[PDB]
Design a binder for this molecule. Structure first.
Ligand code: A1BJ8
Ligand code: CL
Length: 167
């Protein structure tokens, strides 16, 4: 049993809810919140910009130190950093950005990072301003993630479409 409330069960291990991941994290304080990151951990917009704002820019400060030490992530890669006031940990995962020409086959590699954590709160990778089809992102998620993933979908219209089209 966990504290996630109001989710629709899609599969054995995947759950979905129309919710702002920021407000959901502040309420649940999960062990792991997933950020829709880029390789430079520049959290300007989309989910990343929103999560960072909720930490009062502490996420960005920590991220800049991480990059100064380690260099950029790989597309499809991830790193674990602090969850600040939102979660114990933040798993920064780089889905491919279609508006940059990045290979969509890397979306599966991106979701594989979730399997290193028993339970996570997460957005659909490469959705929103990353330019991929959210229906496809949900499908890759279901077919790749084996640990327990709670998806927060901000847009109500999109959430309804994702549920009604789910096979
Ligand atoms: C403030 C905020 N909270 C979120 N919580 C979950 N997902 C988010 N966006 C990623 C993709 N999922 C969507 O519904 C829209 C999308 C960009 C296609 C967000 C955002 C921008
Ligand atoms: Cl986003």
């Amino acid at each position: 049993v966990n504290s996630f409330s109001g989710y629709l069960k899609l599969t054995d291990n995947v759950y979905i809810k129309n919710a702002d991941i920021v407000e959901e994290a502040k309420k649940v304080k999960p062990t792991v919140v997933v950020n829709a990151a880029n390789v430079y951990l520049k959290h300007g917009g989309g989910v990343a910009g929103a999560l960072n704002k909720a930490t009062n820019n502490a996420m960005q400060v920590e991220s800049d130190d991480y990059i100064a030490t380690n260099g950029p992530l790989k597309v499809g890669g991830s790193c674990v950093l602090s969850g600040h006031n939102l979660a114990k940990h933040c798993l920064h995962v780089v889905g491919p950005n279609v508006n940059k020409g990045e290979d969509i086959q890397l979306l599966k590699s991106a979701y594989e990072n979730f399997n290193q954590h028993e339970v996570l709160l997460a957005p659909l990778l490469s959705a929103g301003i990353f330019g991929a089809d959210p229906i496809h992102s949900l499908r890759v998620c279901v077919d790749t993630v084996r640990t327990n993933v709670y998806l927060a979908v901000f847009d109500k219209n999109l959430y309804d479409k994702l549920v009604s089209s789910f096979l």
